């Protein structure tokens, strides 16, 4: 009954992957309000659809800069995935379009902010708070992995909190739809699995490694491997020498011990029972997996929200002007967008 859902979710995703969507909107249809996020080739803005007064997050990619930073294939892949996926912890893409200068992606505004701000502010989450989030990530991965997607970019900076206090995943820049193995050095240091650092040729097991780092970081307040510099973090990672704070329950230690397992072939999520080893684990004994899927569980933390189009859970960034050029830029490279 979960396997039928996935087989039906798989066929849905494959249709929308081969026959998708293009120029569903235009830029003067929107009032630009404030920047919610920056990044190397783009920015994300809270916009207001003038026709309807509804608010969205608009992601604005500069075409020239995307070409400079050799990210064409990543931006195209993010868009493609986002219009083909359907799951309650994955953000919805409402419109995409482009002009002479820019690529645009219009998504649902998620007003609760990054988990990251929340976790640095409180310091750590208690085990049940941390478990609530974990459980959402465990189902999301189960979904994406059945589609053959590896996510690769899991960290609190990339998890947002909605109005109900549940998680939304945005950022499929690095996700890759493959069966078998892949070899790219990519990700964020604290969260890179050992096989990635050792240039081994790796698989979806990396994502469960990342879930362990995330569960640890959520319950501790800090990641399990850090240092001044990437290199010295990587040395700690491949050693597999985790120390756990004393407040960690023994049930958490046991799971964490099975996710941060250096060896691929005894890592939870990569064994024969698959994702079921994580779901039947004792740390998640009190966890109702269906009720989580249906969003029917009172969240233990709900972010403050003062009305539609409130940005109080986001940082302030330096507002820049939207430059639209009179000349078309990078038209061939971005035809499929």
């Amino acid at each position: 009954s979960v396997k039928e859902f996935l087989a039906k979710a798989k066929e849905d995703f494959l249709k929308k992957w081969e026959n998708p969507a293009q120029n569903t909107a235009h830029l003067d249809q929107f009032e630009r309000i404030k920047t919610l996020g920056t990044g190397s080739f783009g920015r994300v803005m809270l916009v207001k659809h003038m026709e309807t007064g509804n608010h969205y997050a608009m992601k604005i990619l500069d075409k020239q800069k995307v070409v400079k930073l050799k990210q064409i294939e990543h931006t195209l892949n993010e868009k493609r995935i986002l219009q083909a996926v359907n799951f309650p912890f994955l953000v919805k893409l409402e419109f995409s379009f482009k002009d002479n200068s820019n690529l645009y992606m219009v998504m649902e505004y998620v007003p609760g902010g990054e988990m990251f701000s929340h976790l640095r502010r409180i310091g750590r989450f208690s085990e049940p708070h941390a478990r609530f989030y974990a459980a959402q990530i465990v189902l999301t991965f189960e979904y994406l992995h059945s589609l053959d997607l590896i996510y690769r970019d899991l960290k609190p900076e990339n998890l947002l909190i909605d109005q109900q206090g549940y998680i939304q995943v945005t950022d499929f820049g690095f996700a890759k739809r493959v069966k078998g193995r892949t070899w790219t050095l990519c990700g964020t240091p604290e969260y890179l699995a050992p096989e990635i650092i050792l240039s081994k040729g790796y698989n979806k097991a990396v994502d469960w490694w990342a879930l362990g780092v995330l569960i640890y970081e959520m319950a501790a307040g800090y990641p399990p491997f850090f240092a001044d510099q990437p290199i010295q973090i990587y040395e700690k990672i491949v050693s597999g020498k985790v120390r756990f704070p004393s407040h960690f329950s023994s049930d958490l230690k046991d799971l964490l011990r099975n996710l941060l397992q250096v060896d691929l072939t005894k890592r939870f999520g990569n064994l024969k029972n698959g994702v079921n080893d994580i779901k039947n684990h004792k740390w998640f004994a009190t966890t109702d997996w269906i009720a989580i899927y249906q969003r029917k569980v009172e969240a233990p933390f709900i972010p403050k929200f003062k009305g539609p189009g409130d940005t109080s859970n986001f940082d302030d960034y330096e507002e820049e002007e939207i430059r639209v050029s009179i000349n078309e830029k990078c038209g061939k490279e971005f035809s499929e967008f």
Binding site: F116, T184, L185, C186, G187, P189, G221, Y222, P223, F226
Partner: peptide, 20 residues
């Protein structure tokens, strides 16, 4: 402590990715 060691690394803020 471990907390204090983490502050001493300078990576308590938003962490960037690496690319190729």
């Amino acid at each position: 402590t471990t907390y204090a060691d983490f502050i001493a690394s300078g990576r308590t803020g938003r962490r960037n990715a690496i690319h190729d």
